[PDB]
Amino acid sequence: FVWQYGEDLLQLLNPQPGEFILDLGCGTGQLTEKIAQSGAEVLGTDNAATMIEKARQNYPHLHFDVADARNFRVDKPLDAVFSNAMLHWVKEPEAAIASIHQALKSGGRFVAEFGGKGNIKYILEALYNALETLGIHNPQALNPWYFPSIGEYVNILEKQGFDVTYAALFNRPTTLAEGEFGMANWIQMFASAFLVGLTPDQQVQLIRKVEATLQDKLYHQESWTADYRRIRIVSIKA
């Protein structure tokens, strides 16, 4: 609940006045504004145009663009690339990493956090079980996420030519918004991959099932929690 909101990753980036920084996967631009407040020159990018449209509405004085993390390019070298809560959607991690490395100046830094090995363990179990009982097999293959260990991610980083200076893998259980609707909203919002071949009524049944499986562990004091576990890294272009 407290954990959902934290500027600790921003403290790790430590943006400076005069720096050119990219917020990769900026969403609605909130962290982008925070970077900007440091005095750094920032650019926010997201792969979703709707997101970028909202961001532009939110922060008319900042700069945003649509771009794909896997193959983006920037006009001038960056002092830093910052990314929070997005890279787990990229199942071609080497491609994103290659793009980040080429976008950075020598000595430039890549600071990131995203879902790590062991992330949302219970939610995923509950999802698979629910599909299974609905008659959908191998639900496991529907998983759209890349949740790596420190060793897995850092290996890719180093192979590309980064000096990795910090890595953490840590739990950050977070309270979901909207009280009793929290889990249903989470599923509607993030689990589309699991819902795509279901009938309308089967989607309702799947949400019921998941809530049922999870209620004892993740529902307390009129709110749902999500068992997040994140990977956090700092890497320097050698």
Domain boundaries, given as residue ranges, for the chain? 1-238
Q: What strand order describes the sheet that includes 219-220?
A: 174-175, 223-226, 219-220
Neighbours of 57 (CB within 10 A): 10
Handedness of CA 13, 34, 3, 211 (dihedral sign): negative
Which among 9, 5, 14 is positioned nearest to 40, based on CA atoms?
A: 14
| Residue pair 48/70 in contact by the 8 Å Cβ criterion | no
3-state SS, one letter per residue, for the chain? CCCCCCCHHHHHHCCCCCCEEEEECCCCCHHHHHHHHCCCEEEEEECCHHHHHHHHHHCCCCCEEECCCCCCCCCCCEEEEEEECCHHHCCCHHHHHHHHHHHEEEEEEEEEEEECCCCCHHHHHHHHHHHHHHCCCCHHHHCCCCCCCHHHHHHHHHHHCEEEEEEEEEECCEECCCHHHHHHHHHHHHCHHHHCCCCHHHHHHHHHHHHHHHHHHHEECCEEEECCEEEEEEEEEC
Neighbours of 188 (CB within 10 A): 13
Residue 24's DSSP bridge partners are 45
Q: How was this structure determined?
A: X-ray
| Residue pair 35/56 in contact by the 8 Å Cβ criterion | no
Phi, psi for 187 (deg, rounded to 5): -70, -45
Which among 155, 147, 152, 165 is positioned nearest to 233, based on CA atoms?
A: 165
Phi, psi for 215 (deg, rounded to 5): -55, -45
**CA–CA distance, 128 with 191 (Å, rounded to integer):** 11
Angle at which helix 30-37 crosses helix 49-58, to 10 degrees, equals: 50
Q: Resolution in A, one decimal?
A: 1.9
**CA–CA distance, 228 with 213 (Å, rounded to integer):** 17
**CA–CA distance, 42 with 209 (Å, rounded to integer):** 44
CATH fold for the domain made of 1-238: Rossmann fold (3.40.50)
**CA–CA distance, 89 with 146 (Å, rounded to integer):** 6
Measured at the CA of 132, the angle between CA 129 and CA 137, to 5 degrees, comes to 130
Residue 229 is which amino acid? R
| Residue pair 236/165 in contact by the 8 Å Cβ criterion | yes
